From Swiss-Prot, chain B:
The chain holds residues 100 to 227 of 229 of the full protein. This is Acetate kinase EutQ. GO terms for cellular component: ethanolamine degradation polyhedral organelle. Artificial BMCs can be made in E.coli by expressing eutK, eutL, eutM, eutN, eutS (eutSMNLK). Cargo proteins can be targeted to them. The addition of eutQ to the eutSMNLK construct results in biogenesis of multiple BMCs. This can lead to the development of tailored BMCs for specific metabolic reactions. It catalyses: acetate + ATP = acetyl phosphate + ADP. GO terms for biological process: ethanolamine catabolic process; generation of precursor metabolites and energy. Induction: Part of the 17-gene eut operon transcribed from a single promoter, induced by ethanolamine and adenosylcobalamin (AdoCbl, vitamin B12). The keyword Nucleotide-binding applies. Homodimer. Interacts with the N-terminus of EutM; a probably cytoplasm-facing helix (EutM 'Val-49' to 'Gln-64') interacts with N-terminus of EutQ. It is an enzyme of class 2 (transferase). Belongs to the EutQ cupin-like family. Changing D73A: Complements deletion as well as wild-type. The lineage of its organism: Bacteria, Pseudomonadati, Pseudomonadota, Gammaproteobacteria, Enterobacterales. It is found in: Bacterial microcompartment. The keyword ATP-binding applies.
Length: 123, 128
């Protein structure tokens, strides 16, 4: 159906932002079409952050991507499979993954996944 | 153990191309010296030595508040319990599943009234 990215948040007087993770609604990530892959950007350069952060969430899909920036991923639910130079790396719920700038990869999950990504630069 | 040995440790796998995966269940915490006299757990997992522009790791502790000044931007992902950050007098609470952004330069109080386990991701990676 309709997938508009949204989230509720609180920002303190000095700029500390807290995002309510339960409130996150996913937009479709166009770069993964024909698959329906969820992505919502939560922290951006508009917050004064050097790093971009957001959530991704999808079921049963793999898609190619080239990262022009470093990325750290934190798996909240399910499992994230990442394919790079032939090898598949798997991060299950509670695991942390680092993907280096310039990596041409396959992002995917054969089951389902929810994760936080943190990228540098924000641009 | 809070009055015992706290050696930071973690298991990981790294692919031929530099993609690294850390087994979160294997993380054992060191004491964060910057939180003393409180016993606060911290283990760095991703560092400039991995070729990373960002530093990342886990922190975990029970019932304790301590002061800290950040010379880096920090994104925090609360995995268990609750994180309370006080900045400019105001307390911000991030529960399990929530994300927090703390701007570079901020002098804060880090704490939890109960317990907390969370991931931090910091830029620059070489802030210390």
């Amino acid at each position: 159906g309709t997938m508009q990215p949204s989230f509720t948040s609180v920002t303190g007087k000095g700029g500390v932002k807290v995002i309510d993770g339960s409130s996150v609604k996913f937009g479709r990530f166009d770069g993964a079409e024909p698959h329906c892959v969820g992505l919502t950007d939560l922290v951006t350069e508009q917050d004064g952050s050097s790093m971009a952060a957001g959530f991704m969430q999808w079921d049963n899909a793999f898609f190619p991507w080239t990262l022009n920036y470093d990325e750290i991923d934190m798996v909240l639910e399910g499992e994230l499979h990442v394919r790079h130079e032939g090898e598949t790396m798997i991060a299950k719920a509670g695991d942390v993954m680092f993907i280096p700038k310039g990596s041409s990869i396959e992002f995917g999950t054969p089951t389902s996944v929810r994760f936080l990504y943190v990228a540098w630069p924000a641009n």
